């Protein structure tokens, strides 16, 4: 049916012409084919073998041009015609990748056929200049109260999510995407963040879980999953965030906003290492290449809030770095920490102690500050930062029979600690982040016993909807808590708390 049409389409491809350049493999070993010919080849050009495998041509040497294969050596053998595509590595870019899972090359692995790509743009293109950037002024909400308030995130921004291996590392990230489904629905196209998850060395099963979760929360319809799977070749893995970034530039340049989540650059680092060693390019500190720093900095300079002459748009990024037992002293962590502005340091002890999200906000910081925080949320969360800090410090005064003052702090802290828990894959609207934090800040949850804290939250919210969902809407639209809103809110919180 479709097949009759498809065969007709293929039949309609039959034009052929003299190939400007060709190579014939001289020898192929270790995925480093050394090809004889390709005299006028462009550098890093995409090359197509007789096996049809793709490569790029990192080394142009006078005697031989050492292509690096992006695929298997099994199907590659000596004296193999290597047609010269004459096109430097480029990937399709366009609005077609929205709600589409494609492999790195840009082929749909969801098999949703041809991508609606209005350009193919080269994988690497240099970062926007000093004047092509302007300051952040657009919050982005993850739907996690702690993250939105304690670590306020905006758009343009680059901040790590550096923490222990598969502690639902991906889960923390995925939560943001789900809250972003709400914003995406919104017609303001700066609030249409076309999220990109870049699955780097992640098994197809792991990405399968992600895909189904995305389908379930209907998040497939703006998602792009650039997929460099665990089995997929280390050159594909290496170029995978770079390739992905070019897609991101298309949105950003178009003035749109989007969020790209590189997961995990630690394994990206390993792939580049594998490649570099195979090219016999020397090791460097922590047996990682020395220009790994250079690589990472290039990638991260493509996340930027562009000047308004260059369009309002931005790309926001949140690289995920996997910590080998929390060793941020490691070369790849140290480098990234300096390049990025903010870090989120997920605290594994807390994870083990069943606190999900698991974060220590002693070791999370954001340097994109309150120009990435909602004004309302800022007001009611200076206190929150301070209270939790005290709860931490006065923790050890409980680990002894000691003053009522310490005990007051501890209760206020414990209720807050309990409040910032949230079973993963439940995002939250900011207009409901603010009330919960208001109550806690005012210590009205101190009375509420720990078991009833969980119950209180949802009840308070439903109460707010029944009593005055006008208040919630008003909070949302003003974006600032007016004296009148704090007035009404104080009354309301008391009444709910009383029951």
């Amino acid at each position: 049916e479709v097949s009759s049409i498809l065969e007709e389409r293929i039949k309609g491809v039959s034009d052929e012409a003299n190939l400007n350049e060709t190579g014939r493999v001289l020898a192929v070993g270790d995925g480093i084919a050394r090809v004889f010919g390709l005299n006028n080849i462009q550098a890093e050009e995409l090359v197509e073998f007789s096996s049809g495998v793709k490569g790029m041509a990192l080394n142009l040497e006078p005697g031989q041009v050492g292509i690096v294969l992006f695929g298997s050596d099994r199907l590659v053998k000596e004296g193999e015609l290597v047609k010269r595509t004459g096109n430097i590595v480029d990937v399709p870019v366009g609005p077609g990748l929205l709600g589409r899972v494609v492999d790195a090359l840009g082929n749909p692995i969801d098999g949703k056929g041809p991508i609606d790509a209005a350009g193919r743009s080269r994988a690497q293109v240099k970062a926007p200049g000093i004047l092509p950037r302007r300051s952040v002024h657009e919050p982005v909400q993850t739907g996690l109260k702690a993250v939105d308030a304690l670590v306020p995130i905006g758009r343009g921004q680059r901040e790590l999510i550096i923490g222990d291996r598969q502690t639902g590392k991906t889960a923390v990230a995925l939560d943001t995407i789900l809250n972003q489904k709400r914003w995406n629905n919104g017609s303001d196209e700066s609030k249409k963040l076309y999220c990109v998850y870049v699955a780097v060395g992640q098994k197809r099963s792991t990405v399968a879980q992600l895909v189904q979760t995305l389908e379930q929360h209907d998040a497939m319809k703006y998602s792009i999953i650039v997929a460099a799977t665990a089995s997929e070749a280390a050159p594909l893995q290496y170029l995978a965030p770079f390739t992905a970034a070019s897609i991101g530039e298309w949105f950003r340049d178009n003035g749109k906003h989007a969020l790209i989540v590189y997961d995990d650059l630690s394994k990206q680092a390993v792939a580049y290492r594998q490649l570099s060693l195979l090219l016999r390019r020397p090791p460097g500190r922590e047996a990682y290449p020395g220009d790994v720093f250079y690589l990472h900095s290039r990638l991260l300079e493509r996340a930027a809030k562009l000047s308004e002459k260059e369009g309002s748009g931005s790309l926001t990024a949140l690289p995920v770095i996997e910590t080998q037992g929390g060793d941020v002293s490691a070369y790849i962590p140290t480098n990234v920490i300096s390049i990025t502005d903010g870090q989120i340091f997920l605290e594994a002890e807390l994870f083990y102690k069943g606190i999900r999200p698991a974060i220590n906000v002693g070791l999370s910081v954001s340097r994109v500050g309150s120009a990435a925080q909602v004004k309302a949320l800022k007001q009611v969360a200076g206190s929150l930062k301070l209270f939790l800090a005290q709860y931490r410090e006065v923790a050890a005064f409980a680990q002894s029979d000691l003053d009522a003052s310490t005990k007051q702090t501890l209760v206020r802290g414990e209720r807050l600690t309990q409040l910032l828990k949230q079973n993963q894959y439940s995002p939250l609207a900011t207009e409901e982040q603010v009330p919960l934090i208001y109550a806690g800040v005012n210590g009205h949850l101190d009375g509420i016993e720990l078991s009833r804290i969980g119950e209180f939250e949802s009840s308070f919210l439903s109460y707010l909807k029944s009593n005055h969902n006008e208040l919630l809407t008003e909070i949302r639209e003003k974006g600032e808590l007016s004296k009148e809103l704090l007035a009404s809110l104080k009354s309301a919180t008391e009444s709910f708390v009383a029951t």
Binding site: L19, N20, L81
Partner: protein, 187 residues
């Protein structure tokens, strides 16, 4: 610069000697006479099999001069100096290598080209001529440059044809087309 850069690994020093044969320009005819020296090496191969044998030092160089005394002098003083150089570098395994490479440089100066039309099977002589003609009637043989088109038999290179000359080919084989057909009907 010699016509066509070989890249010149070892033998490329002798290709630069071919540039010197253009410089003292009787060395162009010296490349014909040095092809006659290669013909003397082609009469040589019982001794050439011994000549791949290592370890002939100054006595090896003298023994090479004895073979040169059996010779009439093809390639002249440049060839004699190459005999000394190759003796000094001690290698008969890149002796004929230099010969082949000098041959490439020589026939590049002459302007002769070598093409090939590998196919699954042999092709008509009518076909041979028609493609040589075609190549002349294309920019590939601009004319001013000769061609030795060799059809090769390689059934492994499946049905249809592949024409090769320069870094330029047309591959209208079966396998590539079948590949494309399959791929799209698996899409």
């Amino acid at each position: 610069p010699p016509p066509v850069r070989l890249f010149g690994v070892e033998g490329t020093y002798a290709t630069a000697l071919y540039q010197a044969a253009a410089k003292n320009s009787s060395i162009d005819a010296a490349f014909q006479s040095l092809q006659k020296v290669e013909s003397t090496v082609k009469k040589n191969p019982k001794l050439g099999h011994l000549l791949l044998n290592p370890a002939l030092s100054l006595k090896d160089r003298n023994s090479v001069i004895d073979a040169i005394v059996e010779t009439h002098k093809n390639l002249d003083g440049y060839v004699v100096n190459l005999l000394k150089v190759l003796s000094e570098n001690n290698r008969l395994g890149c002796f004929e290598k230099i010969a082949s490479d000098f041959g490439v440089l020589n026939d590049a100066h002459n302007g002769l080209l070598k093409g090939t039309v590998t196919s699954a099977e042999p092709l008509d002589p009518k076909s041979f001529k028609r493609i040589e003609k075609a190549l002349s009637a294309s920019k590939l043989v601009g004319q001013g440059k000769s061609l030795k088109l060799e059809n090769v038999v390689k059934p492994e290179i499946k049905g249809g044809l592949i024409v090769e000359l320069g870094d330029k080919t047309v591959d209208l084989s079966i396998s590539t087309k079948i590949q494309k057909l399959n791929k799209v009907l698996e899409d």
